[PDB]
Design a protein around this ligand. Structure first.
Ligand SMILES: *[C@@H]1O[C@H](CO)[C@@H](O[C@@H]2O[C@H](CO)[C@@H](O)[C@H](O)[C@H]2NC(C)=O)[C@H](O)[C@H]1NC(C)=O
Ligand SMILES: *[C@@H]1O[C@H](CO)[C@@H](O)[C@H](O)[C@H]1NC(C)=O
Ligand SMILES: *[C@@H]1O[C@H](CO)[C@@H](O)[C@H](O)[C@H]1NC(C)=O
Ligand SMILES: *[C@@H]1O[C@H](CO)[C@@H](O)[C@H](O)[C@H]1NC(C)=O
Ligand SMILES: *[C@@H]1O[C@H](CO)[C@@H](O)[C@H](O)[C@H]1NC(C)=O
Ligand SMILES: *[C@@H]1O[C@H](CO)[C@@H](O)[C@H](O)[C@H]1NC(C)=O
Ligand SMILES: *[C@@H]1O[C@H](CO)[C@@H](O)[C@H](O)[C@H]1NC(C)=O
Ligand SMILES: *[C@@H]1O[C@H](CO)[C@@H](O)[C@H](O)[C@H]1NC(C)=O
Ligand SMILES: *[C@@H]1O[C@H](CO)[C@@H](O)[C@H](O)[C@H]1NC(C)=O
Ligand SMILES: *[C@@H]1O[C@H](CO)[C@@H](O)[C@H](O)[C@H]1NC(C)=O
Lengths: 237, 93, 403, 106, 111, 264, 111
C-alpha cells in the first residue's frame, strides 16, 4: 500500500476545517472509549481514478464516496478514519480524518471524498470509514465497509497505467513457429526470457543495445522477468 | 512479563520495494483459498481475512500472530496469539 | 359559442367586471346572515362542447335585492357521480345598478360531465337561499359522433372474400395491441391478442358467427359488428353445413349454430340410388326448430326412410337418418294404409312411377302382385312403420318374389 | 505506568512437515533478533521458482510465488529493556504456493 | 372566529392547490351499489356517495342474481372538514364512508 | 382497530418516566419540526398475543418490541409514536410515548413493549414505530415499519377469541342428506339470524348446474337455538348443499359448511 | 377558499364496529387488486395503501382469466394535507388526490 503523493492532503469542504493526518487504525478513542459514539456514515461507494504524479506516472487510485446521516449524532463526529486493507496479504494503510469544527449544521448533505490511495492492479482493498469516536464495547458498529475489486491489466484503460506498463502489458510477443525454428521480440530489460514447449530452452539477458531487436531460436510460450515481476505476470504464447 | 509498557504509535517496517506489486491467487492456485472476515471490535487488527480453502491434500497455511485484545472493565489489554490461516498449499499425503 | 378550448374561463356580462378563482375550492354553504346587495336569481344552462370533451356550461342570472360602486362574489357549486367540485366567480357591477330589477348574468365556461348533474349558487356570505338546477344529460346529437372519440373511433375490421376465402383485414394502426373475439348467436368461438394491422383467414362455411374487436386498455369499448344478415350465401352455407342426426329409432334432433324457423317431413328413398320419393301426403309438414327434439309417430324404423326439411318455404336439407344405423338399404316396397267409417280399411301402393291402389289390374309392378302383397300384409310378415285410427303404413319384403 | 503519553499502555502477556512434502517446497529462514518479540521469525522462501510435480522436477508451467502476510512484532524500546516494548508492523513471507500464470495470445 | 395562528400548536393555515369517466360502475359492476346522498350542511365534501350494495349476491351474465358468491362494501377512512366553531374554520375527521362494492367468492368449508 | 382497555397504560421500566398518551396520529413535529433529530428504531418485531379483560373477553393483541439505537442521538429522543394501519382500509390508531425523563446513557440494551393493540382475524396490518421529533423535510426516515399479518379462525388459537366466537368458528353443524323423493338436516347456533340453504345439482364432473333450488330458514326462536332442524328439498348425482349463516359479525360472508351427495 | 384555518386536532368519528366486521378479499375477489404503498413524508397521511388491479376482467368459475368484462379500479377523492416548502406564504396546503381504494369488475360499455 502507498499514498499517492505526500502533498497538502486536504479533505476540507466549505463550512468545515478538515485536517488530514496519518494513522494506524488504532484510534485513541479505541484505547480510551467514549460513551457517545456517532452514527455510521451513509452510502459508501468506491470508484477508480487516475492521478498524475509530477514525474508523469499513471497510478490507479481509489476514490471513496461516502456521506453522513441527518440524525443528532453529527454533533459527536470528530473525524472519520479511512482504512484500506489488502485481502490476500494483510497490508493495512489508514489515514486519519480530523474535523476541527463541529458538524453542527445539516443545511446541506455533507459529502466527503478521498482519492490518494495508490491501488495496485488486480488487488482488492476493503475500504472502511470508522467514525471517531469509535464504538464502546459491545455497541453498534457505526462503520461502513465494502470490497473494492480492481481488474487486471487486461482492462483497456488500466493497460496504460505505470504498474501495468512496468509488468509488460504493452509487450508484443509476435511469435513465429516454422527442424523447427521460433522467434520472439524483446523489451529493454536485463532479464532472461523463457520459451517453453517437450523441450526447454533459455535466452540470456538482452543488452541495452537490443531494446526491441528480434531474436530467434531453433529446435510455445513466453514468460518474462522484470522488476515488477520476479516470477508472475502475462505469459505470452 | 506480566506488566510491560507497550507504545501504540505503531511504526511501519513494511516500507518494501514499491515496484514489487502483489497478486491475488485465491482463484489461480492449485489449492484456491476463499476469503472470510474475522471481526472483533475489541481487537487490533479488528478484521483479519483468514483462509478457508475449498492426493488433493490442500492443507491450510496456518501461522499465528500477536493480537492486542481488550479486557472487560472489571479487570484492560491482553496480548494474545491466534493460530489463523494465511492461504492453502497442496502437499503430498 | 359552442366550441371552447381545453381551459376554463368566464363569459361575462358587459359593463360589469368578471374573473375566476377556480381551484376546486372548499365549498360549504354555512348559514344565511341578514344585512343593496347583488344576489343570484336563476340558473341558466347550455350544453356546450369543450375541445375534446362534452361539458355542461352554466350561467347565473344576477339582480339586486335587500332593503360609489358595487362588488359581490358568486360561488358555483357542482355535483355528479362520482365528482364534487367548486368554482369561484367574482362579479362587480359598476355604479348600472338598480333596485328590484335584473342587472345581468355571468357564465362559467365548462363543467365536466358524462347521466344527471345538479348545480347550486351561493353568495359569500349566503344572503339568500341557494338556487337549484338539475339536468339529465343525453346518452345522441349530430355533433356527438365527431366530438368524442368514444362513439366515432370504433375499432375497424373490414373483410374481403374475392378469392372465395374470407379474409379479414384490420384497419387499426401499427402500435395498437387490441383484442379479438368470436361468438355465436352465446357460445364464444375463439379469441386472440395480436398486433394490428393483421390478416385473419376465415372460411365461407365458418361465416354463419360474429366478431368483436376492442383495445386492450382499461374500460375497453368493444364493437360487436354483425353485418352478415344481408348476406344470403351465409345462410345457404349454414343450411348446407346443417346436419341431421337420428338419436334413437323414434326420435331425431336438428343441430345448427343458429336457430331459424323450419319444417320437417318424412321421405322414402328407393334402393336404386339418387331418386327419392317424398312421403307427403299423407304426412304433414311439422314445424321444427334448431335444438328442438321431435319424435316421429312411427313405432318401427326402416333404413330406406328419410326426412325432408323445409326452410323458408323451400327444401334445403335431405338426409338418410336411418342409413347410419339400419343400413344398408333393403329392397322393400312401401304400402299406404287408410281406414274409415264402418270399419272399412283401404290400402294403396307407392311406386317410383306413381301411386296405385291395391288390388288393381294395372301393368305396374305392384299391381301385378297386389294379392300376394295383401296376403303378406294381413299375415303379419310385413313390417309396419306407423299406425293411426284413420290410416297406417307397411313395408313389404320383395326378395321372396324376384331374388 | 500510565503518564502524559496516553498511547503507551500496559498489557499482560499470554504466551509441520509440509516443507518436505509440498508441491511448492520452501526453505525457512531464521530472522533471529534479540531486540524484538518473538526473537525468532521463520520465513519461507521458495526453493524453486517453479513447482514440482509427482516426479518432483521443477516445471516452468507451474509457478511458485511467496504467499505473505503482515504480522506483528514487539521490539524493545529503549533497547534491551525487559519492561518496555514497541508495537511494530513487519511483512513475513509465510509460504510458497502453486499458481497458474495468465496466458493469452493470438 | 379566528384570524391568525397563535397559542395553538395544531391550528394551521391552508392554501389552494386542491387539485369525465368512471361514472357508470354503479350499475355496470357485478356488485352494484346505490349512491346515498349523505349531505351535511357543514362538511366538505358536502355530498358523499356511500355504497350500499344493492344485492347481496353477484349478477352473472344471464342477469339472474346468484347466491353462490357474495359482495362486501369497501369502506375507507377519509378526512373531512367539519366547521367549528359554527369565517372559514374547519376540523378534521376520520369517517368510514363506503366508496365501492367488490364482490367476493364465499369461504367454503367442506366436510 | 382499538385499544384493549382504557386503564393505566404506563410503560414504566427502570429509570424511565414514560407515559403512554392518547393522540391523533399527526405529530407536533410534523407541524413544527426541530433541526436536531434522533435515530430510527432497531429490532422492531410484532408477535401474536392474546390478552384477557375484566369481563372475560379474549382479544388478539399486537406486541411491539423495539430497541433504541446505541448512537449518541438518544439525547434528543422524546419518544415514539406507534401505528397499526389497516390493509383494506385506511384506519390509523397512533398512541404516543411522552418520555418525561431525558435518556443520557446506554448502559444496557433497552427492550420496549406495547401490547394494547386489538387486531382482527384473517386481517393484515402495517405496524410502524417513529421516534420523536420528526425529521426536517427531505431528511432520513427516522422510523421503522413492518407488516403485521393476523391469522384466521382456522388457527387453533384464534378460534376461541371473541372475534372467532361471534363468527361461529366453533360451530359444528355436521350436515347430512338422505335419499328421498331429499331432506337436509343441520343444527343451528346461538344467534337470532336467518339461515340460507343453497342447493344445486351436478349430474357429472362436467360442471353443469342442471337444477338449482333455494330455501330460507327463518331466525330461530330461543327454544331451538342449539337444536337440529330438518328441511326437505324438491329435486329435479352431485347435489351440492351449502349452508350460510348471517351472523351479525358476517353480514353475508361466513364460513359456509357445504355438503355433497354420493352416487350410491 | 384561499386561506382557511384548520385545527389539526382530529376528531375521530369512526367510533363504531369495534367488533370484527371486515376481512381481506384482495385475493378471493373475481377482480383481484394488489395493494400499493404510497409513501410521502411531506403529507398527512404519510402512507396510503392504494391498489392496482391484477387483470383486465373478472375470472370465471373455472379459475382462468376471463375477458368478457372489465376490472376497473374504484377510486376516491380523499383530501390530504401537504407541508409547504419555506418559500410559500402558507406552511400547509390541502390537496385532493385520486387513489385506487379497490378494484371491481364491470360490464363493458359496448358488447
Ligand atoms: C324431522 O322432520 C319431521 C317432520 O315430520 C319431524 O317430526 C315432527 O316434528 C314436529 C315439529 O316440527 C313435531 O311436532 C312432531 O311431533 C314430529 N313427529 C311427527 C310424526 O310429526 C322431526 O322432529 C324432524 N327431526 C328432528 C330431529 O327434529
Ligand atoms: C475554520 O477556520 C476558519 C479560519 O479563518 C475560521 O474562521 C472558522 O471559524 C473555522 N470553522 C468553520 C469554518 O467551521
Ligand atoms: C505520513 O506518512 C508518510 C509516509 O511515512 C510521510 O511521508 C508523511 O510525512 C506522514 N505525514 C505526517 C503528517 O506525519
Ligand atoms: C331546489 O331548490 C328550490 C328552491 O326553492 C326548491 O324549491 C326545490 O325543492 C329544490 N329541489 C330539491 C330536489 O330539493
Ligand atoms: C373493405 O375494403 C375494400 C377495399 O377498399 C372496400 O372496397 C370494401 O368496401 C371494404 N368493406 C366494407 C364493408 O366497407
Ligand atoms: C342497468 O344494467 C342493466 C343490466 O345490463 C340494464 O338492463 C339496464 O338498462 C341498466 N340501467 C341503467 C339506467 O343503466
Ligand atoms: C421517574 O419518575 C420518578 C417519580 O418522581 C422520579 O423519582 C425519577 O427520578 C424518574 N426517573 C428519572 C430517570 O428521572
Ligand atoms: C383514549 O383513546 C381511546 C381510544 O383510542 C378512547 O377510548 C379513550 O376514551 C381515550 N381516553 C381519553 C382520556 O381521551
Ligand atoms: C353430528 O354428530 C353427532 C355426534 O354424535 C351426531 O349425534 C349427529 O347426529 C350428527 N348430525 C348429523 C349427522 O346431521
Ligand atoms: C351459545 O353457546 C356457546 C357455546 O356453545 C357460547 O360460547 C355462547 O356464548 C352462547 N351464546 C350466548 C348468547 O350465550
Amino acid at each position: 500500500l502507498r499514498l499517492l503523493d505526500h502533498r497538502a492532503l486536504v479533505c476540507s469542504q466549505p463550512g468545515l476545517n478538515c485536517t488530514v493526518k496519518n494513522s494506524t487504525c488504532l484510534d485513541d478513542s479505541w484505547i480510551h472509549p467514549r460513551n457517545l459514539t456517532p452514527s455510521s456514515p451513509k452510502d459508501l461507494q468506491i470508484q477508480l481514478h487516475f492521478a498524475h504524479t509530477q514525474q508523469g506516472d499513471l497510478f490507479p487510485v481509489a476514490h471513496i464516496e461516502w456521506t453522513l446521516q441527518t440524525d443528532a449524532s453529527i454533533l459527536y463526529l470528530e473525524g472519520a478514519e479511512l482504512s484500506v486493507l489488502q485481502l490476500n496479504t494483510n497490508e493495512r494503510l489508514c489515514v486519519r480524518f480530523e474535523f476541527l469544527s463541529k458538524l453542527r449544521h445539516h443545511h446541506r448533505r455533507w459529502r466527503f471524498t478521498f482519492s490518494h490511495f495508490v491501488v495496485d492492479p488486480d488487488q482488492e482493498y476493503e475500504v472502511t470509514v470508522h467514525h471517531l469516536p469509535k464504538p464502546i464495547p459491545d455497541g453498534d458498529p457505526n462503520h461502513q465497509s465494502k470490497n473494492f475489486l480492481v481488474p487486471d491489466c487486461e482492462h483497456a484503460r488500466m493497460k496504460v497505467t505505470t504498474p501495468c506498463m512496468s509488468s509488460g502489458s504493452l509487450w508484443d510477443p509476435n511469435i513465429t513457429v516454422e527442424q523447427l525454428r521460433v522467434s520472439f521480440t524483446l523489451w529493454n530489460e536485463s532479464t532472461h526470457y523463457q520459451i517453453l514447449l517437450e523441450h526447454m530452452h533459455h535466452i540470456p539477458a538482452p543488452r541495452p543495445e537490443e531494446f526491441h531487436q528480434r531474436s530467434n531460436v531453433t529446435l510455445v510460450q513466453i514468460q518474462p522477468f522484470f522488476s515488477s515481476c520476479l516470477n508472475d505476470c502475462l505469459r505470452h504464447s | 512479563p506480566r506488566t510491560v509498557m507497550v507504545n501504540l504509535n505503531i511504526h511501519n517496517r513494511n516500507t518494501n520495494t514499491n515496484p514489487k506489486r502483489s497478486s491475488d491467487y485465491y482463484n489461480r492456485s492449485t489449492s484456491p483459498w476463499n476469503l472470510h472476515r474475522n471481526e472483533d471490535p475489541e481487537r487490533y487488527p479488528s478484521v483479519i481475512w483468514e483462509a478457508k480453502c475449498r492426493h488433493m491434500n490442500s492443507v491450510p497455511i496456518q501461522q499465528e500472530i500477536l493480537v492486542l485484545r481488550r479486557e472487560p472493565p472489571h479487570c484492560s489489554f491482553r496480548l494474545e496469539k491466534i493460530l489463523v490461516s494465511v492461504g492453502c498449499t497442496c502437499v503430498t499425503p | 359559442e359552442r366550441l371552447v378550448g381545453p381551459q376554463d374561463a368566464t363569459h361575462c356580462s358587459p359593463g360589469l367586471s368578471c374573473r375566476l378563482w377556480d381551484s376546486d375550492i372548499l365549498c360549504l354553504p354555512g348559514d344565511i346572515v341578514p344585512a343593496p346587495v347583488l344576489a343570484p336569481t336563476h340558473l341558466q344552462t347550455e350544453l356546450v362542447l369543450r375541445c375534446c370533451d362534452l361539458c355542461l356550461r352554466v350561467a347565473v342570472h344576477l339582480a339586486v335585492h335587500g332593503h360609489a360602486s358595487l362588488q359581490a362574489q358568486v360561488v358555483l357549486s357542482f355535483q355528479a357521480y362520482p365528482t364534487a367540485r367548486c368554482v369561484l366567480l367574482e362579479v362587480q357591477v359598476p355604479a348600472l345598478v338598480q333596485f328590484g330589477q335584473s342587472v345581468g348574468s355571468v357564465v362559467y365556461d365548462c363543467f365536466e360531465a358524462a347521466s344527471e348533474v345538479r348545480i347550486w349558487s351561493y353568495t359569500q356570505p349566503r344572503y339568500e337561499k341557494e338556487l337549484n338546477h338539475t339536468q339529465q344529460l343525453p346518452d345522441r346529437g349530430l355533433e356527438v359522433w365527431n366530438s368524442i372519440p368514444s362513439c366515432w373511433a370504433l375499432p375497424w375490421l373490414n373483410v374481403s372474400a374475392d378469392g372465395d376465402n374470407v379474409h379479414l383485414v384490420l384497419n387499426v394502426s401499427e402500435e395498437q395491441h387490441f383484442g379479438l373475439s368470436l361468438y355465436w348467436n352465446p357460445k364464444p368461438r375463439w379469441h386472440k391478442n395480436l398486433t394490428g394491422p393483421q390478416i385473419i383467414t376465415l372460411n365461407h362455411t365458418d361465416l354463419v358467427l360474429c366478431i368483436q374487436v376492442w383495445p386492450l386498455e382499461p374500460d375497453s369499448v368493444r364493437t360487436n359488428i354483425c353485418p352478415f344478415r344481408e348476406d344470403p350465401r351465409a345462410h345457404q352455407n349454414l343450411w348446407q353445413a346443417a346436419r341431421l342426426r337420428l338419436l334413437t329409432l323414434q326420435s331425431w334432433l336438428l343441430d345448427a349454430p343458429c336457430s331459424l324457423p323450419a319444417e320437417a317431413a318424412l321421405c322414402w328413398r328407393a334402393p336404386g340410388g339418387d331418386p327419392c320419393q317424398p312421403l307427403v301426403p299423407p304426412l304433414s309438414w311439422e314445424n321444427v326448430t334448431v335444438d328442438k327434439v321431435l319424435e316421429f309417430p312411427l313405432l318401427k324404423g326402416h333404413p330406406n326412410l328419410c326426412v325432408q326439411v323445409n326452410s323458408s318455404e323451400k327444401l334445403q336439407l335431405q338426409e338418410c337418418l336411418w342409413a347410419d344405423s339400419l343400413g344398408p338399404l333393403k329392397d322393400d316396397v312401401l304400402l299406404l294404409e287408410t281406414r274409415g267409417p264402418q270399419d272399412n280399411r283401404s290400402l294403396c301402393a307407392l311406386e317410383p312411377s306413381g301411386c296405385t291402389s291395391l288390388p288393381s289390374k294395372a301393368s305396374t309392378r305392384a299391381a301385378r302382385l297386389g294379392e300376394y302383397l295383401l296376403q303378406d300384409l294381413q299375415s303379419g310378415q310385413c313390417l309396419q312403420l306407423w299406425d293411426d285410427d284413420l290410416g297406417a303404413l307397411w313395408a313389404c319384403p320383395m326378395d321372396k318374389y324376384i331374388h
